[PDB]
Amino acid sequence: GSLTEDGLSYKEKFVVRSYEVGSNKTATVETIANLLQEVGCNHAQSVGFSTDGFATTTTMRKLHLIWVTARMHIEIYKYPAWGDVVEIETWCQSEGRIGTRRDWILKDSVTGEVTGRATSKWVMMNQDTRRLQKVSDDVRDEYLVFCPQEPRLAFPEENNRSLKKIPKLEDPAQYSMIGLKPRRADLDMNQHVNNVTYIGWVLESIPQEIVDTHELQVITLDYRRECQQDDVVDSLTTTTSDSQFLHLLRLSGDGQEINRGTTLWRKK
Amino acid sequence: GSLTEDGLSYKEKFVVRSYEVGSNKTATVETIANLLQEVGCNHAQSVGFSTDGFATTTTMRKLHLIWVTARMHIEIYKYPAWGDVVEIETWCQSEGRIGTRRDWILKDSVTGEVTGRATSKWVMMNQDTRRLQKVSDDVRDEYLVFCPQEPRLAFPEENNRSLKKIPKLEDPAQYSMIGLKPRRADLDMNQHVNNVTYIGWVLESIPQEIVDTHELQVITLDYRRECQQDDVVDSLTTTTSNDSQFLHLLRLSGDGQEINRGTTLWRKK
Numbered sequence: 068g069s070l071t072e073d074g075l076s077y078k079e080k081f082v083v084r085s086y087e088v089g090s091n092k093t094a095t096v097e098t099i100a101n102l103l104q105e106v107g108c109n110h111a112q113s114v115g116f117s118t119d120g121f122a123t124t125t126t127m128r129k130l131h132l133i134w135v136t137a138r139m140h141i142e143i144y145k146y147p148a149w150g151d152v153v154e155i156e157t158w159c160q161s162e163g164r165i166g167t168r169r170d171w172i173l174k175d176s177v178t179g180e181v182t183g184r185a186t187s188k189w190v191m192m193n194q195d196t197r198r199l200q201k202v203s204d205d206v207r208d209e210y211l212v213f214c215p216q217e218p219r220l221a222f223p224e225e226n227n228r229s230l231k232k233i234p235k236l237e238d239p240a241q242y243s244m245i246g247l248k249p250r251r252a253d254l255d256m257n258q259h260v261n262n263v264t265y266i267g268w269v270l271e272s273i274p275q276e277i278v279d280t281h282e283l284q285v286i287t288l289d290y291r292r293e294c295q296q297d298d299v300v301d302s303l304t305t306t307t308s309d310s311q312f313l314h315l316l317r318l319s320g321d322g323q324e325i326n327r328g329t330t331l332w333r334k335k
Numbered sequence: 336g337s338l339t340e341d342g343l344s345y346k347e348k349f350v351v352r353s354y355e356v357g358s359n360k361t362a363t364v365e366t367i368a369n370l371l372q373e374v375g376c377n378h379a380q381s382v383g384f385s386t387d388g389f390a391t392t393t394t395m396r397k398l399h400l401i402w403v404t405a406r407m408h409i410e411i412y413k414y415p416a417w418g419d420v421v422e423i424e425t426w427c428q429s430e431g432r433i434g435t436r437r438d439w440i441l442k443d444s445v446t447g448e449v450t451g452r453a454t455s456k457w458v459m460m461n462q463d464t465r466r467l468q469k470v471s472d473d474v475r476d477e478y479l480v481f482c483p484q485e486p487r488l489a490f491p492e493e494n495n496r497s498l499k500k501i502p503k504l505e506d507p508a509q510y511s512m513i514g515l516k517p518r519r520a521d522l523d524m525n526q527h528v529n530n531v532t533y534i535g536w537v538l539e540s541i542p543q544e545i546v547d548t549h550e551l552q553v554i555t556l557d558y559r560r561e562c563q564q565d566d567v568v569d570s571l572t573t574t575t576s577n578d579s580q581f582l583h584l585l586r587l588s589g590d591g592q593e594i595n596r597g598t599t600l601w602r603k604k
């Protein structure tokens with residue numbers, strides 16, 4: 068992997084591993100999501116930001132400020148097979164005082180064809196109080212020198228799937244998976260649950276028949292609250308429709324929301 | 336990755352990924368175990384065996400026979416850091432009519448120093464009845480051409496940890512983690528739970544204080560029964576011991592049917 072010629076984006080190649088594939092002999096969506104966070108981390112390191120998952124600058128660390136994912140949107144046209152070479156390109160951009168955006172383009176290295184794309188919105192917050200801040204001015208300058216100044220959107224379409232409001236699932240849910248817990252493998256260097264684990268938890272309430280007759284095409288997820296090491300999650304799914312579903316992750320007892328999303332599935 | 340000059344072993348290099356590390360900023364044991372299974376699969380493919388996790392030959396598929404892990408033994412001296420390059424060498428060997436053995440050597444590519452080693456015993460079995468059978472001569476000849484004919488042991492020692500009998504944990508267990516379930520990410524191409532998930536489940540009943548003051552040095556695990564997609568596991572641990580040793584047991588949540596038993600040796604950090 069390396070920053071491109073202009074230094075305003077990063078590229079990296081991956082060979083799909085034997086343990087990274089599911090029932091269709093193709094990469095799981097959790098493998099794809101892990102590959103996205105890997106190239107995003109390598110881009111953060113190549114420009115001097117932190118590599119702890121928060122992509123902080125010098126002044127952000129001085130003020131105990133971090134970047135947190137608020138929303139994610141992934142669209143996959145073709146899942147890579149075992150042994151395939153995928154090329155991922157990533158870049159970040161300023162969204163005024165609202166926050167940051169990180170985009171990804173996935174391509175098959177042999178054909179150069181776009182096989183997937185992703186977008187994510189990030190917000191600035193105090194690491195201890197968790198209170199959101201509007202992006203100041205001294206922070207915008209420390210990281211805008213690494214962003215293209217002209218807009219560069221992985222999903223350029225005027226008001227598309229990545230910018231639609233997600234509603235709260237109403238009880239009773241059609242499908243559910245209860246008592247989900249993260250294990251040590253799901254935790255990062257600072258013992259926080261990996262962002263990709265929440266994707267897997269959402270998909271656990273999808274029935275096995277849908278998974279065996281359909282492929283996941285689009286996934287939009289809102290991150291409301293962080294799940295701790297000792298927290299237990301309930302995964303809820305209801306059909307809204309191709310096949311579409313509405314999702315909800317909440318804490319096992321009290322029912323405190325952690326995530327809500329939508330999935331669009333295509334027949335095999 | 337590629338088979339070595341003599342074709343009797345396989346090597347592959349890996350760069351440790353950001354999401355593959357834990358609290359120490361070093362690779363988790365599940366990442367190490369996944370890297371071992373990856374190079375083992377690439378070696379199976381390089382010599383024409385199946386790549387479904389069973390490493391079957393033509394005649395084995397004709398008779399519905401598969402290789403299954405019976406025991407695993409891993410020793411780690413130094414866990415690789417984020418961005419480090421590790422080199423893994425693997426080879427398999429005939430253990431007469433008992434089964435096969437697969438060995439691994441982990442090295443830091445920059446220093447060439449041995450940072451870890453692993454061994455595993457495999458047994459032949461009918462895929463459907465799950466009945467273990469002695470390895471026949473037809474099968475023995477189809478894979479012996481890929482094994483070194485002289486012994487090559489990752490753990491050559493005359494009385495080492497990889498060949499010690501593991502006892503069954505007696506209730507009450509000192510520590511426990513209940514209601515563990517595999518997710519879709521933990522399943523292979525044929526919807527079987529990945530062998531590395533069982534390692535992670537064993538380590539879930541280790542207290543967080545041990546994990547934060549010690550590093551895992553040795554892990555020996557016996558695989559008695561396969562956990563299904565819809566099965567729920569209970570993880571049990573009791574201290575047996577500068578070092579700390581534990582006895583482990585994985586069993587089904589209800590009835591308590593054993594799936595695994597093992598031992599871990601931890602060194603002060």
Ligand SMILES: Cc1noc(C)c1C(=O)NCCC1=CCCCC1
Nearest residue numbers: 100104107108111120122139262263
């Ligand atoms: C920048 C940066 N610095 O460290 C990391 C790690 C990144 C990064 O790109 N993380 C993406 C997080 C994510 C991926 C897939 C699921 C939804 C959330």
Ligand SMILES: Cc1noc(C)c1C(=O)NCCC1=CCCCC1
Nearest residue numbers: 368372375376379388390404407530
């Ligand atoms: C040969 C072969 N062919 O496909 C695969 C996959 C292998 C392989 O080496 N699997 C190792 C299994 C394992 C890994 C970590 C500890 C527990 C047991």
